[PDB]
RNA sequence: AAGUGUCUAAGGGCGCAUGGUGGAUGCCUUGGCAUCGAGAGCCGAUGAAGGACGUGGGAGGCUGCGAUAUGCCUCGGGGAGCUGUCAACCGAGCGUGGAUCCGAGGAUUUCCGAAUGGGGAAACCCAGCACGAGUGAUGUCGUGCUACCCGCAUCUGAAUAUAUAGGGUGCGGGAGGGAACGCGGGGAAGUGAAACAUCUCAGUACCCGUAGGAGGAGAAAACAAUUGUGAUUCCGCA
RNA sequence: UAGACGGUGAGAGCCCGGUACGCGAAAACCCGGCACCUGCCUAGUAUCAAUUCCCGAGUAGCAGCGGGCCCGUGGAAUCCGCUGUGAAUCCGCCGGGACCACCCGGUAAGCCUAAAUACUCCUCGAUGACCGAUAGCGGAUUAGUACCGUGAGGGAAUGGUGAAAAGUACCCCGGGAGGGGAGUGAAAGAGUACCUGAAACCGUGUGCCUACAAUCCGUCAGAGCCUCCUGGGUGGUGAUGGCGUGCCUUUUGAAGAAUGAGCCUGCGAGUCAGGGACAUGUCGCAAGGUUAACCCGUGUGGGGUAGCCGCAGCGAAAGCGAGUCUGAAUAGGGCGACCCACACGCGCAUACGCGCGUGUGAAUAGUGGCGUGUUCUGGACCCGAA
RNA sequence: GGGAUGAGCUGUGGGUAGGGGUGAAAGGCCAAUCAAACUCCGUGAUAGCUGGUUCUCCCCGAAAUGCAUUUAGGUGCAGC
RNA sequence: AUGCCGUGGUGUAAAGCGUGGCAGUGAGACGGCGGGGGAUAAGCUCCGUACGUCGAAAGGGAAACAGCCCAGAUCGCCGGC
RNA sequence: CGCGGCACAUCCACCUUGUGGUGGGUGUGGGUAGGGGAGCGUCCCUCAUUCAGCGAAGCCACCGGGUGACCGGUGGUGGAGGGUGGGGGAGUGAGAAUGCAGGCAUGAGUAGCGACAAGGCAAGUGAGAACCUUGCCCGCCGAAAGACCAAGGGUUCCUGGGCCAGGCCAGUCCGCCCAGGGUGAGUCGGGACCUAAGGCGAGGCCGACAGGCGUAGUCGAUGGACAACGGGUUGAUAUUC
RNA sequence: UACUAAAAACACAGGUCCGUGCGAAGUCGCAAGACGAUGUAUACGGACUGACGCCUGCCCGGUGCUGGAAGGUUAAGAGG
RNA sequence: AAAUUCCUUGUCGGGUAAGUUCCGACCUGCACGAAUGGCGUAACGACUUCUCAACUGUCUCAACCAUAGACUCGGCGAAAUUGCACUACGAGUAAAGAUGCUCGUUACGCGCGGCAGGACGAAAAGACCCCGGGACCUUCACUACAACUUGGUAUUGAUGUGCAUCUAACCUCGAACCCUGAAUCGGGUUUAGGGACAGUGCCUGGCGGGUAGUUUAACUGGGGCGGUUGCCUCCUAAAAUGUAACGGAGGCGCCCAAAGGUUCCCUCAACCUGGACGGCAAUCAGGUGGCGAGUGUAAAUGCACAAGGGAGCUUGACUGCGAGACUUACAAGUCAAGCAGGGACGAAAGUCGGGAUUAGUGAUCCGGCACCCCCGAGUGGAAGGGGUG
């Protein structure tokens, strides 16, 4: 910038650091689970891979958004503490 | 080749989920003994790049 | 008398016509460039790479060859022309009793060159020994061997005794070259940092040593993290 | 099974060399087999028990100074070099990023090891939206030659008659050179100065103008001549009148007496690479999209999920999550979610609608390809120092 | 014009080499080049500087200001 | 006095604003008006000016004459104002 | 302003009312840096098609055409490749860089033609003579402008030819071009003899490597040692025959 | 000062100071080695001055050089 | 009065008709001076300088002659340069010096020999100057390094009391002998010495223009020198904001624990009149006096309703925030109601997130400290990192 002190220069870092040990989660939805599983029943890691709502060989959670209508036994690595509340509330199960 | 992210500013400024590139504010290091409380909290937290700095600041992210 | 009134080209301009110069354009090509697929990946003291000087019926160059000199022998192929090429002219010949030509193996292979008998301004000079040739005899000619270092094996063992250093002999080996690729070692600067020293450039350029057809690495004092993988290298990711 | 390619007097599958295809090797070398040969085994095994010994040294470790790893000495781990000090042999030693404990992993200080990888002086065989004689190698040509330099080094230029030399006998001018006529040839409007033969440049002939005029050289107006066609129109010229300060660069401003250019011909400057980056145009698929290496194919085709981007964000982070961070806060603020147009379907509002689901966008929303602009790293638009 | 038996001139052969040589010293000379030779290579060095950058038409069309600047003939952002 | 800010009407196509892509420019000149510096010199210098022109604007006028006056060249006409 | 042509933007009405066309309005169209849009020309490839020895390319002239880059037709020349369209790709366009290569102008028929020794006549040769040959006059050098050697050059030497290059003019001449010929050593100058400075250097010492230095030794004349004189002869050799 | 400077510049004989006790000091080399020198303080090297004559005064504060080591400061090492 | 003297041609004397030069002095030495030698000096000098004689074309003042060119003819035949071209002059105009523009004037076309005023003629991308880069040079610029030097430690040992002695490491370019035939090399053997020293390795301090790489600002009516550089206030500034100059004026790089907060109270200066020390001006009293005083500190805007003066109690000179603004290229800077916590003062209303306001300041990086316990390289810790201040 000519010689004044640059914008990459003038400014601080961001503050804080980056945990190198970071469990990064996948992330579904109940109101996607809803929409991909109208009819309910067992959900399991791999079946929610294949239909798409998650990468494959990732750690995925299931997270509170939308509505649930469907009986559904979902079986996730750490649930959402809604996201238990609503599967709960139509009735299915939710399992790590 | 690849292109090469600016190091500096990579730790000076990042990305909302929106996309709005956000920075802290200068003057909040040191000699904060007579800096008021409004001073140092106007200069707390972060700040959207300005409209003009954004163009120069997503090339050196990118 | 007054007046108006063409025409002329020493040369020059413009335009045509017709030429010259020149070598663009176009179209080519016994030449290149970049690759792909296969090979071959070393040559050298049994003298290399590369040369010098010679060698042909005619002068030179190229090319081939080496005093056996565009050539010698053998084994194959082939079948009518041939005596390479700049490069025509001739001259003189050869060839179905198989030439020219093509493939392979061998023979010859001056001198220089690591060059190594010694010397030297590379392609030159001067030897010693042995065996032959030659002379009346010295002269002279031909062929081998004769560097240094290393290793091995034997003999000897200085000052000095044990001994060793050293020396003698006999076998082997090395040396030098090669476009790129490898490994180990040494290692810039310009440059960038809008200056500059940390830093960069870059372990790059270059250099030294040293290979091989490849090399290096390679068989866990490895990673990993609660079930685990199991030499190395290389490619793609990360 | 031959329409590859080239040659042959002009575009040849049937004319030639060949091509598809099929054969082919004395010998040499290479490859493989069988022998021959060489080497190993024909004596160990199992169990018990853990009393004894064995595991590679000036090495490891440690300290100093360096080097190297993302690590630029930092708390510096691992690895390497030198200096000093200097172990232990498994109830050892090393590593797991200071270190300690535990736990896990491995056995340094000896060596060897194919394949997948790199390269092409060189040999064959092909190829080219590569060059075509100022190009392409410096080199189609005496080419690393000539030439330049003491030397290391530097380093050119020069291709084309014609299908076939049929390369012009003979005669004439001329000392020759050169030419004329003849002749050859389809052509000499191909004559070894040779294919085509541009421009600059140089003549010759010819129409008009031009020796009283001050001219960026033209332009508009314009007589008259000349020419060629039917007074008229072309084409040439241009007496005479007006207007009129070259081109480029660079400048506030140049006709400038600022720069560059004698002329012509040829050559001479935003290019290419990358799943780079940003933005766009376009196309494919779409909550998905797409592969990389690689594998298989005569190809451009088919596989290939590793990975990448999208799919949820907030926070320094633990973490929580349509929220999250700060905060004592059911305070406030920051960032993030409320995703689109058309339609139906539901749990139903009289038929018109909140939400939620199909669908159809084959720009949805992303993702991948391709085009373009810009950008990054490369010489990076080209030329130029000391 | 100076020296011209001398610290003379000159031949032949040799030695000293680039941050080096040599210099009765002028930064002189070291192959017509010397305040660090020449050649090749790094290399297409770098140059905020000078120059150059090639066909056409259509539409729009600036700036020579502010701020900052080891900055002032450069550049970033703004302005246009 | 102007100028400036707001506001309500009226008028005015190529206003404005946001956000992206691509810029160039960041040596200005003169003239009018208001000022500084200078010697109320300079074709001087430094500012201001919803001032102009040149720059980047040909045509007409000013003898010639970037910057003054008139006027902004789409092309053609041997028409007019 | 009038009349005619074009273009851009925008608006209104018909046609598959946006891919957009048609008609009509309205406004606009100076322009450097610069942005955006749309095209011309060259080459190559692919697909289709069509020309071409009854003549392609290229070039030249003339006549025409388009809003521009430019295009077409005809003829001449020429001798083997072009045209058009859908696409694809560029070493795709020059007037400038004191740009590069080649050709050619301008200066200009100009300066100069290289010492201030000096030429002349007669005859000859010849196509051609100031320059060549012969003779004779004249002049110049003569401590060189003569005769030799070394270094260096390399055949320039001699003979016979030649005469378009070269020679600063011309040339019959020539150190130019072509061919053939020519250089004879026991004693000359060198080696086979010797060593100087210096060079190289077995082993060696030193140095990470590269390599440096150096002993023995071996080279290295410009020096030391070493045996020939006089005459004749060829076109060209001679202390050589 | 080859090629615009020949001088008053350089050198010089003479002078002084400093260094050097000997593979010296100095110099060239990483070293070995070499020159110095087949020299040995009447010698060698460096510095300044510059025949010869008369002379060369004051300052040791600064900076050098030479010598000294009482004390202060201090590196590695040891220590812990 | 100088190879030194600026003033300066100093002054006096001499030399000349006339002497800024010359010679001799004077001393007022800008700024002489003793080995960067002082002052002299025979001889010497292609040195510099002044004078005289002689001599002369140096000159008054030129003339003539010959030769080589020039010129003519014949032959051969370049060059630098070149945007063009049927390239006048004057006075103008213009990038401010015109062949090319204006208005005039002058001029038949073309050669030849001459001259040198112009074509800002040609030649070398100005050597001067400035700007950018470089090079080399210097040094008490910076940072390194070589060399030199210091100590520790290894090589490196023994004995006694750091010191001494010893010898065996190591050293010797002392000597002899052998390899060796030829050897001033080398090596070995012996001897004579030195000797745990020296040298060398590693570590370490010093010194170190000897060498090396570099830096050494910009603005600027050219550059240098001088001055300046950030912040605050005013004027310039053209009645919003903003606005330049090396334009005109000043301040700041703090201070205050109260000079902050709050509650309450007060009004100043000056003048006049009277009054022991006391006066023009100390304190007192009375009038008059609305701001002429004061304000911590420049100036401006403010403040008498006070923000000026005094007193009481206090720490809001807070923590968590912050709608919305101003300003602004960005980075920054500035204001802020109001909400909550926990307080101060106040009876309450309320006010208080420093100071009447605007200067008293410094981005980022890299670190330090306190707290929080966020991460913690197999795990538990820890190291280290992170957050907040
Ligand atoms: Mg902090
Ligand atoms: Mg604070
Ligand atoms: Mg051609
Ligand atoms: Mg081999
Ligand atoms: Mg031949
Ligand atoms: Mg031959
Ligand atoms: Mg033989
Ligand atoms: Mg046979
Ligand atoms: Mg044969
Ligand atoms: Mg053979
Ligand atoms: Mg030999
Ligand atoms: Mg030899
Ligand atoms: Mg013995
Ligand atoms: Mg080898
Ligand atoms: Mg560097
Ligand atoms: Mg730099
Ligand atoms: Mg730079
Ligand atoms: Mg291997
Ligand atoms: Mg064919
Ligand atoms: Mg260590
Ligand atoms: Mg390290
Ligand atoms: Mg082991
Ligand atoms: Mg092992
Ligand atoms: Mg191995
Ligand atoms: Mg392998
Ligand atoms: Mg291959
Ligand atoms: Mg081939
Ligand atoms: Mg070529
Ligand atoms: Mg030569
Ligand atoms: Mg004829
Ligand atoms: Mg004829
Ligand atoms: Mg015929
Ligand atoms: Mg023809
Ligand atoms: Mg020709
Ligand atoms: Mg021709
Ligand atoms: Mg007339
Ligand atoms: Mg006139
Ligand atoms: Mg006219
Ligand atoms: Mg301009
Ligand atoms: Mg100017
Ligand atoms: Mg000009
Ligand atoms: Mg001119
Ligand atoms: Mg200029
Ligand atoms: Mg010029
Ligand atoms: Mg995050
Ligand atoms: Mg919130
Ligand atoms: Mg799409
Ligand atoms: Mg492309
Ligand atoms: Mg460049
Ligand atoms: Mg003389
Ligand atoms: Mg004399
Ligand atoms: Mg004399
Ligand atoms: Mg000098
Ligand atoms: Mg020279
Ligand atoms: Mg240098
Ligand atoms: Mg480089
Ligand atoms: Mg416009
Ligand atoms: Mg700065
Ligand atoms: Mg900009
Ligand atoms: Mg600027
Ligand atoms: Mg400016
Ligand atoms: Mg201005
Ligand atoms: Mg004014
Ligand atoms: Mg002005
Ligand atoms: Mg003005
Ligand atoms: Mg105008
Ligand atoms: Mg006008
Ligand atoms: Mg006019
Ligand atoms: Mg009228
Ligand atoms: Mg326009
Ligand atoms: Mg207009
Ligand atoms: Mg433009
Ligand atoms: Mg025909
Ligand atoms: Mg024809
Ligand atoms: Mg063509
Ligand atoms: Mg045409
Ligand atoms: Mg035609
Ligand atoms: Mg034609
Ligand atoms: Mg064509
Ligand atoms: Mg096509
Ligand atoms: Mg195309
Ligand atoms: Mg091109
Ligand atoms: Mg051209
Ligand atoms: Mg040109
Ligand atoms: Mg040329
Ligand atoms: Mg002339
Ligand atoms: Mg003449
Ligand atoms: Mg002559
Ligand atoms: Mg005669
Ligand atoms: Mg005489
Ligand atoms: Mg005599
Ligand atoms: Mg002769
Ligand atoms: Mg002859
Ligand atoms: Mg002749
Ligand atoms: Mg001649
Ligand atoms: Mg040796
Ligand atoms: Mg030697
Ligand atoms: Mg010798
Ligand atoms: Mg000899
Ligand atoms: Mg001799
Ligand atoms: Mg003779
Ligand atoms: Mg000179
Ligand atoms: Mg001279
Ligand atoms: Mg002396
Ligand atoms: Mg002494
Ligand atoms: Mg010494
Ligand atoms: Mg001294
Ligand atoms: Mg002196
Ligand atoms: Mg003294
Ligand atoms: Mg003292
Ligand atoms: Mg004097
Ligand atoms: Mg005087
Ligand atoms: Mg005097
Ligand atoms: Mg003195
Ligand atoms: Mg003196
Ligand atoms: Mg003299
Ligand atoms: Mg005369
Ligand atoms: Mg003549
Ligand atoms: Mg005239
Ligand atoms: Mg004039
Ligand atoms: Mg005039
Ligand atoms: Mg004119
Ligand atoms: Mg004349
Ligand atoms: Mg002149
Ligand atoms: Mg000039
Ligand atoms: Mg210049
Ligand atoms: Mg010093
Ligand atoms: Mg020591
Ligand atoms: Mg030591
Ligand atoms: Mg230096
Ligand atoms: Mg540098
Ligand atoms: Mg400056
Ligand atoms: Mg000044
Ligand atoms: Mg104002
Ligand atoms: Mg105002
Ligand atoms: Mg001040
Ligand atoms: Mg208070
Ligand atoms: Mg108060
Ligand atoms: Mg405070
Ligand atoms: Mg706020
Ligand atoms: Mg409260
Ligand atoms: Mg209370
Ligand atoms: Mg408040
Ligand atoms: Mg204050
Ligand atoms: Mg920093
Ligand atoms: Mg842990
Ligand atoms: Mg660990
Ligand atoms: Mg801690
Ligand atoms: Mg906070």
Same mark, same amino acid.
């Given at each position: 910038?000519?010689?004044?002190?640059? &914008?990459?220069?003038? $400014?601080?870092? !961001?503050?804080?650091?980056?945990?190198?040990?970071?469990?990064?989660?996948? &992330?579904?939805?109940?109101?996607? &689970?809803?929409? $991909?599983?109208?009819?309910?029943? @067992?959900?399991?890691?791999?079946? !929610?891979?294949?239909?798409? @709502?998650?990468?494959?060989?990732?750690?995925?959670?299931? $997270?509170?958004?939308?509505? !649930?209508? @469907?009986?559904?036994?979902? %079986?996730?690595?750490?649930? %959402?503490? %809604?996201?238990?509340?609503? &599967?709960?509330? @139509?009735?299915? %199960?939710?399992?790590? | 080749?690849?292109?090469?992210?600016?190091?500096?500013?990579?730790?000076?400024?990042?990305?909302?989920?929106?996309? /709005?590139?956000?920075?802290?504010?200068?003057?909040?290091?040191?000699?904060?003994?007579? /800096?008021?409380?409004?001073?140092?909290?106007?200069?707390?937290?972060?700040?959207?790049?300005?409209?003009?700095?954004? /163009?120069?600041?997503?090339?050196?992210?990118?």
């Amino acid at each position: 910038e000519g010689g004044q002190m640059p &914008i990459h220069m003038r $400014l601080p870092k !961001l503050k804080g650091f980056r945990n190198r040990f970071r469990t990064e989660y996948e &992330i579904v939805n109940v109101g996607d &689970i809803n929409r $991909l599983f109208p009819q309910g029943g @067992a959900v399991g890691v791999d079946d !929610l891979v294949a239909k798409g @709502a998650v990468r494959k060989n990732a750690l995925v959670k299931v $997270l509170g958004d939308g509505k !649930l209508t @469907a009986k559904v036994d979902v %079986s996730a690595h750490k649930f %959402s503490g %809604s996201a238990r509340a609503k &599967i709960t509330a @139509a009735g299915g %199960s939710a399992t790590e | 080749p690849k292109a090469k992210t600016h190091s500096g500013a990579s730790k000076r400024f990042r990305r909302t989920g929106t996309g /709005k590139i956000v920075r802290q504010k200068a003057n909040r290091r040191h000699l904060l003994e007579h /800096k008021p409380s409004t001073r140092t909290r106007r200069l707390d937290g972060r700040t959207v790049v300005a409209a003009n700095d954004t /163009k120069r600041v997503t090339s050196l992210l990118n």
